[PDB]
């Protein structure tokens, strides 16, 4: 049914269809079905049609997630650009932030090789 209001991952297993939400993976699924006593070993194709909303105002209140998360993400960075620190420059210049090596690798901050020869 209409599960996670924002995104909807119907016709899958709950706990795991949870994981496919910007901010959900595994232990997030643990405390959920261990605070709202709803059994995890279920689908969504046939459950009690009331156990759809009890996960909302729990998951959808205390913390932040989905579109309500990349703000903080986008937050803790623009500053670091406008702050002039060397770490802020990392994100910009196509470079890594947990300081690796750039004589090789660092494709994950790049994406393509460019050769030039």
């Amino acid at each position: 049914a209409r599960i996670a209001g924002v995104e909807i991952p119907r016709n899958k297993r709950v706990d795991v269809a949870l994981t496919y939400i910007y901010g959900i993976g595994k232990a997030r699924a643990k405390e959920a079905l261990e605070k709202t006593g709803i059994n995890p070993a279920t689908r969504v194709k046939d459950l009690t049609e009331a156990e759809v909303v009890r996960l909302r105002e729990y998951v959808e209140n205390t913390w932040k997630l989905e579109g309500e998360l990349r703000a903080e993400v986008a937050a803790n960075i623009k500053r670091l650009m406008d702050i002039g620190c060397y770490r802020g420059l990392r994100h910009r210049r196509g470079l890594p932030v947990r300081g690796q090596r750039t004589r090789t690798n660092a494709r994950t901050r790049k994406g393509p090789r460019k050769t030039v020869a």
Binding site: R98, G99, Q100, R101
Partner: peptide
């Protein structure tokens, strides 16, 4: 830099003894 100074990555290259490991 896997196992060096100021990141967090991985230690199957730096070891751990004397590093932060229990002594006495």
């Amino acid at each position: 830099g896997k196992g060096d100074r100021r990141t967090r990555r991985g230690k199957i290259w730096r070891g751990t003894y004397g590093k932060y490991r229990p002594r006495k």
